[PDB]
Amino acid sequence: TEFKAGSAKKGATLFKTRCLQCHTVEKGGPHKVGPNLHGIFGAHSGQAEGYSYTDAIIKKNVLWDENNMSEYLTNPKKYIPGTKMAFGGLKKEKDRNDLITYLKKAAE
Numbered sequence: 001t002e003f004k005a006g007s008a009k010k011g012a013t014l015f016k017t018r019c020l021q022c023h024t025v026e027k028g029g030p031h032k033v034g035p036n037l038h039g040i041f042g043a044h045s046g047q048a049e050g051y052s053y054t055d056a057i058i059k060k061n062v063l064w065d066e067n068n069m070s071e072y073l074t075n076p077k078k079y080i081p082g083t084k085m086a087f088g089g090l091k092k093e094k095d096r097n098d099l100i101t102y103l104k105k106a107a108e
C-alpha cells in the first residue's frame with residue numbers, strides 16, 4: 001500500500017493519548033464526542049448508527065482503509081473540509097503507521 005506495519009504497542013499508547021479523549025474502539029463501546037470506531041476499516045465515513053455526523057463527513061463518502069485513514073489523520077479538516085473532528089493531526093508517518101497498526105487490530 002503506502003502504509004507499513006508499525007508498533008501495535010506503540011499505536012495503543014498513541015490512541016490513548018491522542019484519540020481516547022473522544023473515541024472508543026471496542027465492540028460495544030459508546031459513542032462519545034466522536035463515534036465508537038469498532039468495525040471502521042472497510043466502512044464508508046458517517047455510517048455508525050446513533051451518531052450525529054456533519055453533512056461533510058457523510059458526503060465525503062470515504063471508504064476507510066489503512067491508507068485513507070493515514071491521509072485523514074495527517075490533517076483531518078484539510079482532508080474533509082467542514083468536519084467537526086477537532087484534531088490537528090499526526091504529521092509523522094511513523095506515528096501514523098503505529099496508530100493505524102493498532103487500530104486495524106483493536107477495531108476488528
Ligand code: HEC
Pocket residue numbers: 015018019020021022023033034035037040044045046047048052053054056057073082083084085086087090099
Ligand atoms: C475530539 C477532540 C476528537 C479527537 C481528539 C479525535 N477525534 Fe476522531 N472524530 C471526532 C468527531 C466529532 C468525529 C465526527 C466528525 C464529523 O464531522 O461528523 C470524528 C471522526 C473520526 C473518524 C471518522 C469516523 C467515521 O465513522 O467515518 C475517524 C476514523 C476518527 N475520528 C478517528 C480518530 C483517531 C484515530 C483519532 C486519534 C489520532 C481521533 N479521531 C481524534 C472527534 C475526535
